[PDB]
Amino acid sequence: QNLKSTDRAVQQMLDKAKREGIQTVWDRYEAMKPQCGFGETGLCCRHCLQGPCRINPFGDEPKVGICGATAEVIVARGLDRSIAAGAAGHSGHAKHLAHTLKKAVQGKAASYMIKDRTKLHSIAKRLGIPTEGQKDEDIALEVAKAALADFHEKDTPVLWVTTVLPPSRVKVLSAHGLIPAGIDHEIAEIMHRTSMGCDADAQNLLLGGLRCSLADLAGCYMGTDLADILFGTPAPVVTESNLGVLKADAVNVAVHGHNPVLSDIIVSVSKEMENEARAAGATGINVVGICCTGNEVLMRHGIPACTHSVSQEMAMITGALDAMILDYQCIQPSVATIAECTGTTVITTMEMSKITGATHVNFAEEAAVENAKQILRLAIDTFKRRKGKPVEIPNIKTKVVAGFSTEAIINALSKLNANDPLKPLIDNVVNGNIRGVCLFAGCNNVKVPQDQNFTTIARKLLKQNVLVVATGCGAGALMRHGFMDPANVDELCGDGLKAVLTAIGEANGLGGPLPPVLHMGSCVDNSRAVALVAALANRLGVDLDRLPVVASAAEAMHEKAVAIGTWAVTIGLPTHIGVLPPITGSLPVTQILTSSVKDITGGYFIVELDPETAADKLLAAINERRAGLGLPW
Amino acid sequence: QNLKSTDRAVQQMLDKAKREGIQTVWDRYEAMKPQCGFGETGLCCRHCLQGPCRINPFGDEPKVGICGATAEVIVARGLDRSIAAGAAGHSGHAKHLAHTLKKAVQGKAASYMIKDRTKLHSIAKRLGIPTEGQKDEDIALEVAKAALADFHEKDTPVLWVTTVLPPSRVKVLSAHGLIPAGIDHEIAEIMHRTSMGCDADAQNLLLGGLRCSLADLAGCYMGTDLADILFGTPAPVVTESNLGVLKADAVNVAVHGHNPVLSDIIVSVSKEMENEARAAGATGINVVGICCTGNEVLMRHGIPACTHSVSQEMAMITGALDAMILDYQCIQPSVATIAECTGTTVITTMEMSKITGATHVNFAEEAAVENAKQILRLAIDTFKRRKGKPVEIPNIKTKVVAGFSTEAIINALSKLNANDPLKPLIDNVVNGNIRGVCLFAGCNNVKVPQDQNFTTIARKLLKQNVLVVATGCGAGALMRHGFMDPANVDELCGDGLKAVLTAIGEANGLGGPLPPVLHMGSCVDNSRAVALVAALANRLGVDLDRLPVVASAAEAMHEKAVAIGTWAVTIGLPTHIGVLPPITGSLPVTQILTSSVKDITGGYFIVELDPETAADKLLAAINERRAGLGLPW
Ligand code: SF4
Ligand code: SF4
Ligand code: FES
Ligand code: FES
Ligand SMILES: [Fe+2]
Ligand SMILES: [Fe+2]
């Protein structure tokens, strides 16, 4: 089982699934091999009913699509549609939150409110919305209206791009025509230009993809902004992760998917329903997280993380998961079938994301507490049905310190320099105690032994004094392997990095260091890393493409991860991807994405499937940036 | 060559291409065989980087996608993305025209103007925009703003759906949640819900597809509306079609793609440049049409149609095509390479639709006449370069009567009944002189011998007294085979239909009948057929799903044709498709689309590749509708 996952809790549940005859994602992958080499390389097109078309990577015919589309075109069009799809998921998430904020301050959804007034005012200021002498509700209405307005063309470009990046970066992007006009506008334009008989120039197509990736960034940033207003900006919190956070004697409820509009209310209502749970013979309701919505409630409330991404089915295999409450994205639809075996009640809540065989309980923000209680009573009933059945919860968990929003990192740093909080971090980049910064992002992928790339690359970077931050299921991987426990600083960190983490933590009264890796939140909260990096660029008076900052989507899966990787490149970062995206069938497209885009945005992809080699390449990219700043390395 | 195309002009050029060693679309198709059976059946997914996934239609593993996606889900998701792509092309086209109208009436694009004031006022009235005591420019600004507003969520649904269908049809759709909230909103929601780990219920997915298809209808209707305001509503016109419309002694310029914003100006400027052409030794500039933009200028100005769809490369093979002026959609990118052999100057004009190797001359509506002159001087220069080279223009053309907008059909009918113009048509449906109405729509497809399905089905329906209307390259197929020449009424039409066409034509002073098939315009002008059918429904006091009206996408290719077929079903029509869409890998999805959708919208797909059998099935669908109205059949 170590060939499937490096997580021992997952390994134990894989053994249970095997002896019970429950098919898993790894089993479905084995049954798919060998995968199609046309799809793997990107040399397949189904954009019209003359298809399917393919192109042999090498050899004889077919060499070109039926309409004349070259390998360059076909590869670029497929990639662009993946970017648009990722941007779309983020569009739905951010729009969901904008409409919730609007309903809240209009009196239409009393379960929701302005929780972070300071965040609201700062966002208003950044956007140019007046606040002096205005009521909070009015300010919030204006911020929500501005959010919705960024989805379509208007007299300004997308403000959740142009107001979040330094002017010099906006200028570089503008000169290449890359600033998005509207989020859903760009998505639609990608779908148009990639349809048959439209754009058929690889460079042109890929420039369109870069612009659409900035529409994805806007959606991520908007999502973080609005979720902080509604639910609170994260601050440092302590919790636990891995399957051992499940409790046989409690009603175990996983929140899975993405939007805190749902999960945040599940958490608060679960506490209100403690005595009912107890009446049912449980100790209470134990809410646990899976995937990004789990990260959201981990970051804000310390809700323990059960599992992530590829291993999500394993929570069910314990026999103790009473309910799995879903909104959208990254949910293996297998969960609905596995539930029939395990007893778990799988509940969908959003009209556009249903799964055949799952119970659907519409969740309306207008009725959020009522709808949550209906959902949680299904969970309590399920708990009662497993009275006396043995369960197998691996007794495996890690300690996790998390909650490192950008505000929280700045506050922590301010204990070393009150009126110039970024300066202690920069001082230590300059003196070499901090070599650079690496953001780990994105998914696990069944092709890669689960977490192996994240932990292999992170260990090499930490020993080389890189400040490592993480989001999404990258953060999930690292937390499940102890990278968020300050007790592991001595083992994992280089001496320079250890000194910095210790100095910050001691200044924050911890008696101890910050954790080895800073958890910056969900996948939309990759936008928090952008805020931190943009703040550093502005403090230094340089653009992002001069900073010793890199990203790694070390085990990427979703279209959303493709979009995030692409905007990381577009804003100026060297960006590793540890799985093959479907580009290798076109050398000209690969050369664009890994080399000549440097001349456009300063960023570039690093495609490298071997994690030791990836770590070396990421260090070389950091050190090249250090040399460009005149720094030792 | 008759196995490739049933068009003798195309056959002649296929012989020329063969002896000159010029690869064609048919050659590229042969080189693609056998095509992938996973793609053909829809049983392939590339929606994440764990893919590509496939499912064996029959036999053993693989049976399910890696994430657990079933065949039902995979097929429905792929279909939905094709619908969204089609809607996107129509979004770009309609938005292009809305922005042009806005610029025109703001003084920013003087080459454009309100040409159809009556159309402007009628659209304003339909939308609920006041006109009394307003200036035209102000009314037009409001119509343009309303058009743009339909792309995003607002306080009303998409008005280019809800104001163009009868209230009872809107009510049926509303009850199923199918009215679109915004055009680009729906496109993005499709891309989201079809991304990994989101919607995974076939019925739910397909309902989303029906709603997105209505966003495509809205874009089509908006495109027709705005193009009529700007360029004039079509009225009956006489012209010619097929390759023989090219003239060796003229500068031959094809307009190809879709938007009349470009082609309409090319036509007017070409006339202004006649003496320059002559100075260059040509007789003048001979503008000819390809694909929908050709249909646009055919319908409004009588510009002759050179060719359509799959045979577009053959215009170049004559050696006489001096320029091919492109905007977007349905342009085989092979044209850029073939031009190197033939001498033709291929010119792109839109930032989102470039072709490697083609000359790009940006076209700005603000500078339309200047930009058109630059384009046309490239064409004149090309003419001069072929002085003394032999050309091979097949001396093959047909007469075409066209220009049958809905307004034009109503006006023609009003000569028989001035104050109840639809009544003569209904009278003849009732007495059986008109059995029903069939709309032919959509593309040619290289899999089908070009035009064979359109002409085979049309001949059977016309002998059975069906009133046949056509758009796009369906209209193209029929016009190239003589179905738009009134001289062929005796041969083609049943006696009842002949009597009706004769009576209308004689009442309109023609001395002769209307043509066998009524050309209702470009593919967006499928919306004109909707206007006619909705007007008939309202006059009769019934919904569209009770009328003896059908549609046939007899040789469909583009994603746009998939979208149009799907909204034809959604508004209540039996809708034939004569090529296999990638659905056969899921029986449950096929059963939805061909049978149980009848219980939702009253419409349904008829998938039938044999055209004689298709004609029988279309007649049975018409006759079932007649029986439901209590009529003989
Ligand atoms: S768009 Fe071109 S390459 Fe793609 S399926 Fe259609 S003919 Fe083939
Ligand atoms: S979304 Fe599911 S079926 Fe599609 S490629 Fe990814 S794992 Fe395979
Ligand atoms: S030929 Fe396998 S992905 Fe299309
Ligand atoms: S396996 Fe051929 S279309 Fe994917
Ligand atoms: Fe996520
Ligand atoms: Fe068209």
Curated annotation (Swiss-Prot), chains A, B:
Its EC number is 1.2.7.4. [4Fe-4S] cluster 2 binds at C45, C48, C53, C67. Binds 3 [4Fe-4S] clusters per homodimer. Binds 2 [Ni-4Fe-5S] clusters per homodimer. One of its GO terms (cellular component) is plasma membrane. The keyword Nucleotide-binding does not apply. It is found in: Cytoplasm; Cell membrane. Its main location: cytoplasm. [Ni-4Fe-5S] cluster binds at H258, C292, C330, C443, C473, C523. One of its GO terms (biological process) is generation of precursor metabolites and energy. Belongs to the Ni-containing carbon monoxide dehydrogenase family. This is Carbon monoxide dehydrogenase 2. The gene is cooS2.
